[PDB]
Symmetry: C3
Subunit: 357 residues, 3 copies
């Protein structure tokens, strides 16, 4: 476990719900007798693609007693309110972020009926929401779907004579072949590696295979994960989080993983390629500049990503780093409120509780 990790080539931020935060996958396999290879021109996935499984949406509830709304007017209602004249009819409650896999494009969320939904002839452009009379709609009719998900990059396919022991990234990251498998995405053939990255290079598929690891390291990963899950348990309870606690969601080993922040009291997600950091100067060459992708990362409203913030005098507070310095800071400790809980998440079975709005 390096002292620290910092994302390389960070993707754009997507707003998410609290329930979307996931504890990092901290597995990383070493390089042994596998160092030489041939440079392989291959395309891999752009960082936005890994934020394609979060589809923005709103919900719609009709009334005079509640009635079953239909998509067309729900949209023009949702298009108003985005600027406001009538304010009522169809009650529009947002954000309603859902997950969806790239393959069947199935949607998954507690606000959707039976936990999930699939666009069908009977619902071509909406989901039912296990409410009496509320239907869920995405914010882009096309659900931010696209296949412009690849870019050119140069790596080295690693020799072991004839056989392939692994891969090495354009960044330099050794990614092994231990948990690699072959899979087409968007009509291109490529390899799917344990780490999460997909690469286009062809030779010869949530879970985790953990049989070839020393007890000591599999115990440490379980330690790490449980720590993070307690924090998640408490974030979900209190709808709040401290920048300290948020740092437990930072992928602790080099590799692809999520990067988390808070903007406008909403949790935000992006994808990056994590690189080991050995010296605080390597990412803070002076106290006021967090170096990410060769640029000072400015942040927003004093908040960078992954629990990093900026104090009252402009200095960067990296939780892990302050903690190793025994220098406590109330700003790292204060609970940041994430108020929004969507009404129809915990809903069951003349006018609902969301008569409030």
């Amino acid at each position: 476990f390096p002292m620290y990790t910092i994302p390389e080539g960070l993707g754009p931020w997507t707003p998410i719900d609290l329930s979307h935060l996931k504890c990092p996958d901290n597995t990383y396999f070493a390089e042994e007798g596998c160092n030489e290879g041939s440079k392989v021109s291959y395309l891999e996935l752009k960082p936005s693609f890994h934020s394609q499984n979060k589809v923005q949406g709103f919900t719609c509830t009709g009334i005079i007693s509640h009635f079953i709304p239909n998509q067309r007017d729900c949209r023009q209602a949702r298009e108003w309110k985005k600027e406001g004249d009538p304010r009522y009819s169809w009650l529009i409650l947002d954000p309603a972020v859902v997950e969806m896999d790239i393959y069947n494009k199935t949607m998954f969320s507690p606000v959707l009926r039976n936990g999930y939904c699939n666009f069908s002839p009977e619902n071509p452009d909406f989901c039912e929401t296990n409410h009496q009379h509320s239907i869920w709609i995405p914010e882009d009719e096309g659900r931010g779907i696209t296949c412009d998900i690849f870019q050119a990059s140069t790596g080295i396919l690693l020799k072991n004579g004839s056989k392939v022991c692994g891969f090495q990234d354009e960044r330099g990251l050794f990614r092994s072949i231990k948990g690699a498998c072959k899979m087409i995405i968007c009509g291109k053939s490529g390899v799917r590696l344990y780490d999460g990255t997909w690469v286009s290079y062809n030779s010869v598929c949530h879970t985790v295979k953990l049989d070839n690891i020393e007890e000591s390291i599999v115990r440490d990963l379980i330690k790490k994960r449980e720590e993070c899950l307690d924090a998640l348990e408490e974030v979900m309870l209190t709808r709040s989080i401290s920048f300290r606690k948020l740092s437990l969601f930072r992928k602790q080993v080099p590799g692809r993983g999520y990067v988390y922040t808070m903007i406008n009291n909403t949790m935000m997600e992006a994808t990056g390629h994590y690189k080991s950091v050995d010296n605080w100067t390597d990412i803070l060459p002076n106290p006021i500049c967090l170096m990410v992708d060769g640029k000072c990362h400015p942040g927003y409203d004093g908040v960078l990503f992954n629990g990093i913030i900026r104090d009252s005098r402009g200095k960067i507070l990296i939780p892990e780093m302050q903690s190793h310095l025994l220098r406590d800071h109330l700003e790292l400790l204060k609970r940041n409120s994430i108020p929004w809980r969507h009404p129809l998440v915990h809903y069951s079975e003349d006018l609902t509780s969301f008569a409030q709005l």
Copy 2:
């Protein structure tokens, strides 16, 4: 400490308050010089007995209306009448409706209390001074911290019974150091003493289990005969469960993850907690070591306890175990070791009920009902 641990002989559930959660005693002692012996036949304690510490009950509060509101000290007789009306759907609701005056007995339940199984002394924060004793001046009821609110057990008999033994067969091992369960789990004489229960002759072992045979200071643990590293881990584990308990009592919610911290990590007698009807539930069981998940999970959807797949309640089992939507058995410790996160195991499950007369300081605000 075994990988996991599963109850044998799982007794019936009784409802408890969150405060009755009790972090397990994880002490278990070795067999290093006690080979074989003669199979003896004996009486041990039915699990239900170990739940005689808890006595279900309710509370009753006199209610005088207005005219054009007030408090009186009712008697058990028609508190019990109004309580029974509340159990079936008699218009006891009409009672709590609003010169002209109305008398009503406001029933508030559950009010589970703790009881000295011998003193028969009940303990609660609802009882006046946190305890109560039946007397000729209160034959069948108790006083609370509210002068106009009485406490009454649901069973006039407070489940006091002596039908608490029954027949079991095991092995007395020769050296004589201890006895082997009908479950085959060694118990040592280490930390044992003598005592009489329902007039009977028997020994109590460190486990607390009682067996009928003979070949006397008697709750406590001494833990001297324990190496440093182990007692550190016992403390480590216990403090970890106490953290869970503190947050449970505060938040009045509990996640199945954390619920698993109350299971006895070692074989022997201990409690088994589950959640039925939005209420904590307690039963007693004899715990058995587990070395391979497939011994309890003959397939993904069957949890093996007392020979049968446990059906579980509301797709939820005990000790933090649940069923997913398809029936898959989620055992927290198991999932955790596979690095497989489940929100079902993380959602804080609400145990909302909090009795008004707990920590009440001498018409009342608790009264709009």
Copy 3:
């Protein structure tokens, strides 16, 4: 780290806010080749000095309509009628002053600036334009100290006698009158109330000028590089555990006597001592010493030995998590935990209710629910 730790020469209690809880400094430096030296007779700091950071105060709000800006002593007169009884409560039911207290503020004891969220933009300085009060983030509410002199004083010194230790003619450390070695590592020279002396790394000052102290002190208000790795990351475990304790207090406005004991200094030396009275948190200051055997401090189940005398406590609460049960047994959280003896009274989350309305405030007004 000693099994436990007990405050010697315990000063008085100052009511603090929850946010004023601080996680201890568990550093301590051993002796190597620093055995004996010359006895000395010095001045050291009264423990109350270390709570001079906390200036009590109240806020006075002018009601007539709160639409009236109150004069400073239209407010003290109102506040002193709250302290006792009087018509105060009858103005609240033409000109009247709603008093809202406590309103503790931190103060830098040299430039005398006060800081708190009830103050305008979170801080305050006296000026000829407010020689005896402060502004709030509400235009009709001022803030006023409880003492005109904000606890300022130079009567902060006490006479005690130490041992000045020698390796060579180089001085390596002191031995306070309690007996506890305090090294010279990270010591500096400073002037308090016009006396000059050395500030040792433990938060203590003694008047006694020694050689090789050519550098003066920067901020009274830690750093640490020459310590065993194992030790430094042990300390980080303790700090982090205390910081978690604190994150939940601030959120929930409550704390258990289990949790509270995580704030006690794990090593001998100057440290804060915390308790609750009257549903308010409370800080004091003492010179902690190692406890090696519980009976040293618990000679008998009902008496906790602090400064020769049994500590009475207040409402069954003595400090640092120590409480008295229904019998009057002394429950030291650490001691109960090592015996695996659970007690609900330790787990119980004790409420710290008070939230002064004017914290981050931004006709008539809403918190004016007549009090």
